[PDB]
Structure 1
């Protein structure tokens, strides 16, 4: 509901807050790399998929420019090292949700990654397992944000990863809901990680999880769902479209 009662209670007066708000992260992902639609099949040939990835890594001028900003601002910087540590961040952060430890979960994931994953999951028991990463993790894209006001620069590194995972969600009474723990399900994930540059303490965080438009449908739920139709008041008749 978007409502303001202007008639009676006025409007909250305009205040100058003596602390300018400090943000470790910024919600938006600047540019979403739109992946090739045949990448389900193209992945069967590794020297094709990884060739296209590496090719578009070398060829992009925007990506190279952001790479240059991160490399000048933060010396001892390698992009061949990144998809390894970025893949480590997963095995750590998913284990963090498994164990429901939010302390270490604040170090890894970004301000924007945290609220969703913690919010909807919090009253249940979640067990997750990383068995195989089938295709070696590739850095697809890099982006740099120039904040003119703060002088702040934000690096964003996309990692695409093929993965094999087992997920079991027990509901708050202990009974299963989403998935079996004994099936090594095949999962492909688009990921974005973030970094604050002007920041003296050099933080690299998981920012967001991107899903392609042609992404395979997820596993079917156990319980039956009932979707109620539009509610009819006393004099309002029902109308049915074709």
Structure 2
């Protein structure tokens, strides 16, 4: 005579889309942000004694050669994008500074003859901010010729010229974590002088947008 309707189970139609604190362990830091005493562009003895006592075998006279080698090797591995080697050669502070922009583009950095041999300018040490952590910083002046070419994703050149070398004067500060075995000197920061000449202009023409204003807002 009559057949009753059958309802589906409710669950079928009721479905939905599927969606550090204090502890014994602490974050181990291999670097300190910034420089203890920033070298002013145109104390060291006690600091180098503080370095030497931990090292037992350290030479200032040999350090520029090592510093040069570290610098060149780091900048070279930028070309081949080997981050593993960069980490060994470069401080954790320095890494993002020289890596973040380089992503999704090609660098053809190269090194040619240095006009003036590199030399140490300032030596500083940590003031024991953290227990079992001591940091030693060496600033080196480097006056070198370098070549640089930066390209796009698409391989279109952005910056510099491949063949032509350019003179560059840089202050490079190197940091090492003392009291820590297996530690080594790594490129930490580059100090920019206030009187520094401006960098070579980019090929691209840019637009600097004006203040985007709401209708009620009036331009000054």
**TM-score > 0.5 by shorter chain:** yes
Instruction: State the distance in 1 between where 2:141 and 2:44 align.
Output: 15
Aligned Cα root-mean-square deviation (Å): 1.1
- CA deviation map 1:109-157 (0-9, x unaligned): 0000101111011110100110011111010001110225413210000
Match of 2:44 among 44, 63, 67: 63
Match of 1:230 among 208, 211, 219: 211
Instruction: State the distance in 2 between where 1:149 and 1:156 align.
Output: 16
Return the offset for 1:27: 1.3
Q: Is the 8 A contact 1:146 1:152 kept in 2?
A: no
Equivalent residue number for residue 32 of structure 1: 38
Instruction: State the distance in 2 between where 1:208 and 1:85 align.
Output: 16
Gaps of 5+ in 2: 1-19
Q: Is the 8 A contact 1:96 1:105 kept in 2?
A: yes
1:215 is the counterpart of 2:196: yes
Which has a greater percent of helix?
A: 1
Equivalent residue number for residue 80 of structure 2: 99
Equivalent residue number for residue 163 of structure 1: 144
Instruction: State the distance in 2 between where 1:33 and 1:223 align.
Output: 34
Summarize the Cα distance change of 1:190–1:149 in structure 2 as closer, same or farther, 3 Å threshold: closer
Match of 1:82 among 54, 63, 69: 63
Equivalent residue number for residue 52 of structure 1: none
Rg larger for: 2
